[PDB]
Amino acid sequence: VPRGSHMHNYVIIDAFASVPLEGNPVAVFFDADDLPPAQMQRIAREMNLSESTFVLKPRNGGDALIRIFTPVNELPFAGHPLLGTAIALGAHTDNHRLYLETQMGTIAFELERQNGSVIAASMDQPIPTWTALGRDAELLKALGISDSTFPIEIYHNGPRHVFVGLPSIDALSALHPDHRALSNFHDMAINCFAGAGRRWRSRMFSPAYGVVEDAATGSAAGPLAIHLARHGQIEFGQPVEILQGVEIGRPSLMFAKAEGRAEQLTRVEVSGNGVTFGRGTIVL
């Protein structure tokens, strides 16, 4: 029974995974031009996934304009939701590349297909800026630890991401943050990392963005590759694999590479697999 003038089709994509029930889900809503943004926000709250996206007609030469909502706020750019959106739209085109307009500009995607299905995509992210957070004691207390292995810096590529280093994967898994205390950190996500060489583990916490713990924070993957190189953990330009979401039962694998030098970054690439979990229609 419709409860509006338009129904909307949607697909659920598990981003940063090659099998369903892993990765980070995103609900992608098609033909969304009739929806007021306040209604988009309410739909995102209804789905209760880390993000829902809304596919709109392009306005600046791209293939589509995408608006991105967490359960509580709109974001101007986000990695897992746009990866899932690109994979979902990939089912309706033969094109190798897709150009998704966002509030941070047009994001270029390269799609990978196997046996007629889009199985993965790679994006060029906005090049982030960064500075010291300057709230170290407060943040470490909220996380329940005494120190970060590296300087605590906050990066901006639309959302904001703070990085806190842990000395081992066991120490990362042992974190039990005070999420009420973390709620004093507005308009940012807290990304905690540990690992070595090519392979890193992450956990992300963001009351500001409406989620206790997120499974795959794609817009943090590019900045982490920069952060690791700036602090001598990898060489600049080394590709990394970032496994997030293990503790919450949503293992997600993000691939990232940042080209250049800290003061002259030229590209920040993030890629991953994705798979369709479901499809449906909503009544408004």
Ligand X SMILES: CCOc1cccc(C(=O)O)c1N
Binding residues for ligand X, per CB under 6 A?
A: 50-51, 70, 75, 78-81, 159, 189, 206, 209-211, 214, 217-219
Query: Contacts with its own copies in 184-203 (CB under 8 A)?
Result: none
Active site residue 51: yes
Spatial contact of 210 and 72, defined as CB atoms under 8 Å apart: yes
- Report, in Å, the least distance between residue 99 CB and its own copies: 25
State the Cα angle at 188 between 182 and 190, rounded to 5°: 55
Q: CA nearest 214: which of 7, 26, 18?
A: 26
Name the helix (H) or strand (E) containing 161: strand 160-165
One DSSP character per residue, 110-131 reads EEEEETTEEEEEEEEPPPPEEE
Half-sphere exposure of 38 (CA within 13 A, CB side): 0
Among 33, 178, 187, 259, binds its own copies (CB under 8 A): 178
Judged by CB, which is closer to its own copies: 59, or 180? 180
Q: Which one of its own copies, ligand X, none interacts with residue 283, CB within 5 to 8 A by kind? A: its own copies
- Report, in Å, the least distance between residue 2 CB and ligand X: 27
Spatial contact of 256 and 227, defined as CB atoms under 8 Å apart: no
Q: Which of these is catalytic: 51, 153, 213, 269?
A: 51
Spatial contact of 68 and 107, defined as CB atoms under 8 Å apart: no
Among 13, 15, 40, 43, binds its own copies (CB under 8 A): 43
Among 212, 239, 266, 267, binds its own copies (CB under 8 A): 212
Catalytic annotation, residues = 51
Interface with its own copies by CB under 8 A: which residues? 1, 3, 10, 12, 14, 19-21, 25, 39, 42-43, 45-46, 48-49, 117, 176-180, 212, 249-250, 275-284
